[PDB]
Amino acid sequence: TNPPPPETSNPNKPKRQTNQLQYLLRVVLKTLWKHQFAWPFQQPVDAVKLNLPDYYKIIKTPMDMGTIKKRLENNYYWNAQECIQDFNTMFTNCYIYNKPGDDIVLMAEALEKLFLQKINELPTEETEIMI
Ligand SMILES: CN(C)C(=O)c1cc2cnc(Nc3ccc(-c4csc5c(=O)cc(N6CCOCC6)oc45)cc3)nc2n1C1CCCC1
């Protein structure tokens, strides 16, 4: 009833490390992880614990910062854009499922606003770093 967590490691997959991806782990996610509103996003949503029957009917691609952190540590992404998409998927799922003004929505918007501030300091070019 609770689907398995999303994939965090996969053999024979396009994988590498870039200066932008390192910045996503060492600076961006590091700042968002220690936010006061971060804990509801540090692990996948437990739909049966929170009594959300129609969650996985609406949300087709669940995503959370715990999964993103593991994917960054395991070098699961091919470039930075693949990781930023996972953040935007996480935010959008909360916007899709919940009414505007709800508590969990306000917390997600605060994280996204901070996320976009830390993203503006990303290096201009994406250069490949050895693993
Ligand atoms: C004032 N209260 C009740 C609190 O301080 C409080 C005590 C809590 C105990 N456990 C949790 N766990 C929790 C863990 C994950 C989520 C979550 C992540 S995405 C997402 C989402 O999209 C929708 C929901 N909902 C379930 C509750 O509200 C209706 C919509 O929850 C989530 C929500 C809650 N939150 C707790 N909270 C807050 C309320 C919800 C988030 C934090």
Numbering used by the authors: 43 to 173
Paper text:
In this study, we describe the first in class rationally-designed triple activity inhibitor that concomitantly disrupts functions of three critical targets based upon known synthetic lethality relationships in cancer cells—CDK4/6, PI3K, and BRD4. SRX3177 showed nanomolar potency against PI3Kα, both bromodomains of BRD4 (BD1 and BD2), and CDK4/6. To gain insight into the molecular basis for inhibition of BRD4, we assessed binding of SRX3177 to BD1 and BD2 of BRD4 using NMR and X-ray crystallographic approaches. In conclusion, in this study we report the first triple action single-molecule inhibitor SRX3177, which disrupts cancer cell signaling through simultaneously inhibiting CDK4/6, PI3K, and BRD4.
To obtain the atomic-resolution mechanistic details, we co-crystallized BRD4 BD1 with SRX3177 and determined the crystal structure of the BD1-SRX3177 complex. In the complex, SRX3177 occupies a large hydrophobic pocket located at one of the open ends of the BD1 four-helix bundle. The base of the SRX3177-binding pocket is lined with a well-defined water shell, which is conserved in other BRD4 BD1 complexes. Superimposition of the SRX3177-bound and H4K5acK8ac-bound BRD4 BD1 structures reveals that SRX3177 acts as an acetyllysine mimetic. Particularly, a hallmark contact, which is required for functional bromodomains, involves formation of the hydrogen bond between the acetyllysine substrate and the side chain of Asn140. In the BD1-SRX3177 complex, the side chain of Asn140 is hydrogen bonded to the thienopyrano group of SRX3177. Large chemical shift perturbations in 1H,15N heteronuclear single quantum coherence (HSQC) spectra of 15N-labeled BRD4 BD1 and BD2 were observed upon gradual addition of SRX3177, demonstrating that SRX3177 directly targets both bromodomains of BRD4. A slow-to-intermediate exchange regime on the NMR chemical shift time scale indicated a tight interaction, in full agreement with the nanomolar values of Kd and IC50. Treatment of Huh7 and Jeko-1 cells with SRX3177 abrogated binding of BRD4 to the MYC TSS, indicating that SRX3177 has pharmacodynamic activity against its BRD4 target in cell-based models.
